[PDB]
């Protein structure tokens, strides 16, 4: 079965020169091997010169001097640069500058890709580093004309206000939290600037309502907020519009400011329009005029960004490619089921969240991630690291059968001297792996493919695929967003993706939202400006493209768990958010909030390019190519270490050369390899290429990322111009086929200080005597205090920190509790002297209000816990006194059944409730069916006087549970009271038996079979 | 340079049959391949029959039927048993039964080992299961005649008393503690039976002093103590005497009991003497008579234990062997430095011990290991597991360069199709590993070697060595003690080991102590009775061999740390204990106390047979042999899994046979291999060998312990009888060459309850706003309580228990602390409402009495902490106001130097204990007082000076205090914590810079 379908279009990538320029440069067709000579004939190529100019203006100036014949001092460093760019212009399809370009194709019944005469169109635009220099300059002068909004990242925490990264930053301050004080005039500003205010309109209101007299005090105040980016002006362009520069000119035209600058920007816009029409190689002088004019307006290092479009004549591929890729995804998703814990840090974080907050609350995203008021971030987040000493250990738990399979594959490959390992469908089927569930399949993806034709002599589309060095991406659209200004109809592309996303998810519960973010170092944002079609937008440190009706704020995002998976909800909308980011922003370097919102959008989905064998082979210096059918998934690879290569920074060439030839002979390294960083394809039978090799080896300390990969050395290239071959990469986007409380964390209702109506004691060192201490000591003392009316009620339960303890909670007034504490000390000293305990502590009681039904019902649940304590004490005593001889399993079963009977869950439901969560251990059938039958009044149990004692104890608890059950059903705001019933059953088991998960599981199984067998009697 | 020297002697081990009996049974020289005929011929061999009789009387009875010509039921099961025993009699030197024997050799200038005609002596003696079956019967009938002692394993905990393993146990009970109530008449008996007492003398004291009037009450009391083994009778023999049965016959003569039993025991003793005189094979009829006599006295499964001595004529080996083993030990101890954390679980336990008890306390062994009053055992101990939910993840931290070295070795071996990997001294020297220290080299060891002539051509001692399957032992004499009754002069062997141990350790402080333990399942102890020459003995559940002067009791042992290594000490002796166990008792199944005492004796020593490459190759299904010079360190090995042998329990033979022949060719498995369990050497070219293979493989589910190892296929055997080869194994023992408080844990002095004169508050949620919370809020509130005289003093510090918090401690009376608690509540609510904290708790204050000098000086240290808190608040406030602008590093250095100066540690010591203008304290910090900033700083610090001088003089005045520099170091660590919190890097920097500045000032001091 096919799991994915294609979209309407795909991306084509291709370098500017054919492969012939590469082989011809290594003297393929000419005897000359002079160091210069050819070096002059490459610098006479105008397309090579213009490509260098747009990328590195320093290296350009050296090439001019070289053609002038001037002495160039380094020359060594000069050759390395020229060689590396000549290679990168012929061999690396990845699009950058003018070295490589992009185009968009369509699926067809045949493959044909061709170049037109009018190949290569330029798309130049201003760099964001340059634009934002002008924005700051203007608003630093003319702010009285501007309109301001509050920064949507703001968080207000007590008397402090915060932003997600440091602004107006300081080396003495970035060592800790940086914040402004939330003074009353700041809180007034926060309400006025909510949706934009004119500067003069804001100023006079503050001067009015605070009198001040000194006008300069308010000007100085507002300047601080603007300079620290708590206020954002209208001039700053959105990243989500199609043209940031046109936006800025429009805004300065609305303000009617700096009229001389408006003309200069218009002239720059016209010069830039002229430059984009010049063909490649003709633009050199035109670029320098524009670059000089822009440098005269704002002096920054980057100024211009340039892209180019291939402008192909034909651009069709045989849709057969989609049937092949669907085969690959099946085997990879099957293999993904062998890893049991693929995200160990996020999985640990769920346990911390549940232990703090339970299942029934939604928590503010910014509170939750805070170190002081939250639980902090996951332990692998490096922005504001978690300051707690938590355990960082992890294990993904690979299946030992799959570890064996790949190790036998490796051994057989070495023994037979095979350069590749092949996996096969029927070999994987024999592994007996668990099948993937549909909800775990990822909803869209992108894969990068190099395509070569396997034989022209068969006159057929026999294609060989290699997965590209970057593999792909986790969502369709991320690779395309960077080129939205080059697409003919970008809105129609993203509307399709948005429609298919909405089609795959639950209707009416979800809305789509885009995340947009401008970092402090704005060079990084030049790849982060893109179009989108999500309904809502959250724009941080920038103006948004959306109207204020569709604007979202970080302090409005609440996080919850459902089905053990995280979701995000907007409180103002009361909608769940489906979150998108249409660009290749790296999550691991973003602030923790953005990284977390990225992570949870992929929660419980498989990551398709996380390969199982990666951990099996991580220690080998050599790995064969891994392939499936006609896909090469990973290339053949070699790496270098201090054992196999013996190199120092004091080592020298010729000495390295001898040492490296021994490596090539020992490991079989072929003539062509990639050096897997930015140096790429190296020809080893050429001494200048080994000079690149040694310089990298020696900077990389002879180990660091010195990884060699084989070249794609079979098949032939599919893209041709006349007779010249071009190397070509496809990006294929795929979409999944569809298969049919307001109580705050520190409210005084939730958290009770010591002696604030409750005294909460932890008793340590109890494990050897737990049952005698409960049944005798605690029972007598607390039941005496109840009769003297000193306390109204108590309950206890057993827990584990490191070390086991009893938790004992007493309820009264603060006055009465402080009055008796001296007698509690004497009591606990007497217990210690007998050796029954070691030490104790007093703690804050944190009330689980939402779990037991809200602020009304938890008062009744705390009475239910009081009566269940008494019954437990009485059962433990009668058991110790020998008054009956039932096993622990029988007492558990009877207690569970008596709970459901008194809570009022009718028999038709009971079995299904005790299911949904011992077959040969039922062999006591007659005993269990006799005892668990509640009919008449436990008639089968009352048969023996031992059983009569037992039921007369349990019935002390009955009437309060009935009352609690009726109120839970009487409440219309509470639903699935079966979750409340389940919670109180766990606590009774804890009280009687302690922590034993297998024991509790046994009691619930062993009682579903007796209730089932009583079907004929109900 | 040689690290080890030989002892006077070594052990020789040899099977009872020559290897020719193996090849002749697989038709080496025979055309016939019938299963019978040969099956009849071996069953007519008298040595084989008696060997089977001594080991399994069941199978012996089947052999007799088979020779009587009856038809056996199983027959197939009959074949595999006879094959397995014939092979084990021919090929496995490990001594057991009559299958194999032992002898003791001496070193010489040349090797010659030869059998005499008088070979093979029997050494039969009774089994302990039978001895103790008889002992229980007598002490049940005749207890009134016996003398009794307390069980030396006893522990008393509050009102309960406990033993280290369950007695009179119950399957419901064994899951938890089992104990007797320590009632007053028990505590009286515990004093009376200290040195032993007669039953009547004990009974009538108790009856009198408790005036019980009903005599039967005390009888029924003492019977329960005896049945539960809280009392031990004189009849029960020591495991550490030479003959347990002669001891038992002697004690019943002293007691005069049951004289009709005593003559029967004496006659059993006589018949046993005659049996030991019979040659092997001649004894079947005499064994059955003695066996049936003994079974008539006590019916139990085992009854008799038998060994045999080889009685070699010649037994010299060339002393050259000792030089080769020194080379092996050099290269192995060199490799051992590549692993940083080889005992991961015990290192965690050292951290938990430092956390709970610190560096200055000695803790009772049975308290420390207790789950409730102690910290429990290490997390890998299986006898009462640690019930705490700790993280058990562990890592040994192998050096990445050595992993690379071994991985390129393995790749190169597979590529060249080589069957072995060789390690070399110069290759290891290029790894640039750290050098092993002399204190880490283990004091003694034993190594097992199979020895072959590399060739006969020279008639020369060119030897090839294979390390035996069990490798060796951690201590000299562990392999030997099991044969103490067969040695000619056992005391002279064990005396020289004790003397060599006493010579290696520190004089005067140490004594040697033997641990002896009898388990509840006594069959396991038949290998645990041995002689020793240690000065003291601890005997558990048994009588000892020593007088009461030299008896040690388990509740007398205290544990401490020194130099980050554990030691054990006796409180009565006031001596450290050098602990010995001269037998192969497995520590991993012993009670937690015995396992911990074993682990102590090896702490911070290397374990020589823990091979580094064992972790690197653990995932591979084939491994070449690892060798060095002329040692094969590990054999070549293959293992089977569900990928390479697709077999199931439903799989039939023939299909297995075709499946396996494929595996052989793919992996190159040779003709002879060991199946590494109790089936051992297999000839794969023979079909019944394949039947043994498949039978094992099916039960082992095609995975469990199915490891194949190659045979020692080159060289020739060195032991000959005329012209018959025997396989021979040596055990070489070696010894290292020498290179020249009374305050209990729950005393009211130590632990203070909440409001018990101390109020101890932990404040959470504070990490964003420390320094402001200290300098303003805590400062202004607590100092105002001192002015009111509501509290006498306070101090604070910063800690982590996962979450960061402040620890704030206030001192007053209980009545005053309960009176003001409402205002403390109002105070902390206001701090919370500003968002400066989240929640708080009240905790017990556990005072570090021994760290700060004992019960008197601790009261002064707590005043030093009070004045140091005030100075920290003042410095933090002045910094926040900007009254000075020094770096944190400057303030740290000045405070450290001011501490040493005011504590009175002179300059000549300061640079040994650990900018120039500021740290020069001369005149009156005159270089600092020059600026106004420096005058403000120094005036704050001088608030602290007077109390530190007073404290320092009292420390030096108390002659009971030693290394007062540890007190100064402690209080300097606290000052840094208050100002900067927890950052180990920053303090290390601050101290380093201060030392450099003080050293540069030598001309000025």
Author numbering:
A (entry chain B): 2 to 741, 754 to 930, 937 to 1037
B (entry chain A): 2 to 741, 754 to 927, 947 to 1037
What is written in the article reporting this PDB entry?
Maddinglicin A (MadA) produced by Clostridum maddingley belongs to a group of antimicrobial peptides, the so-called lantibiotics or in brief LanA1. The first necessary step is the dehydration of serine and threonine residues, which is catalyzed by the MadB enzyme in the case of MadA. The structure of MadB in the apo-state was determined at an overall resolution of 2.7 Å. MadB is composed of an N-terminal glutamylation (residues 1–741) and a C-terminal elimination (residues 742–1038) domain. MadB forms a homodimer as already demonstrated by SEC-MALS with a bifurcate cleft-like structure in the center.
Similarly, for NisB a RMSD of 2.6 Å for 1383 Cα atoms was determined. This indicates that the structure of apo MadB adopts a conformation in between the apo structure of MibB and the substrate-bound structure of NisB. In the apo state, the regulatory loop is stabilized by hydrophobic interactions with Ser154, Glu230, Tyr518, Ser521, and Phe542 as well as hydrogen bonds between the hydroxyl group of Ser180 and Glu178 (distance of 2.7 Å) and between the side chain and backbone of Arg229 with the backbone of Thr168 (distance of 3 Å) and the side chain of Thr168 (distance of 2.7 Å). Surprisingly, the comparison of the apo- and bound-state of MadB revealed a RMSD of 0.2 Å for 1792 Cα atom. The only change occurred in the vicinity of the substrate binding site. More precisely, a loop formed by residues 164–179 had to rotate by 8° to free space for substrate binding, while other minor conformational changes of MadB were located in surface-exposed areas of the protein and are likely not relevant for catalysis. Interestingly, only at one side of the apo-MadB dimer a tunnel of the GDs envelope was evident. The tunnel is protruding towards the corresponding ED of a monomer indicating that space is present for substrate binding.
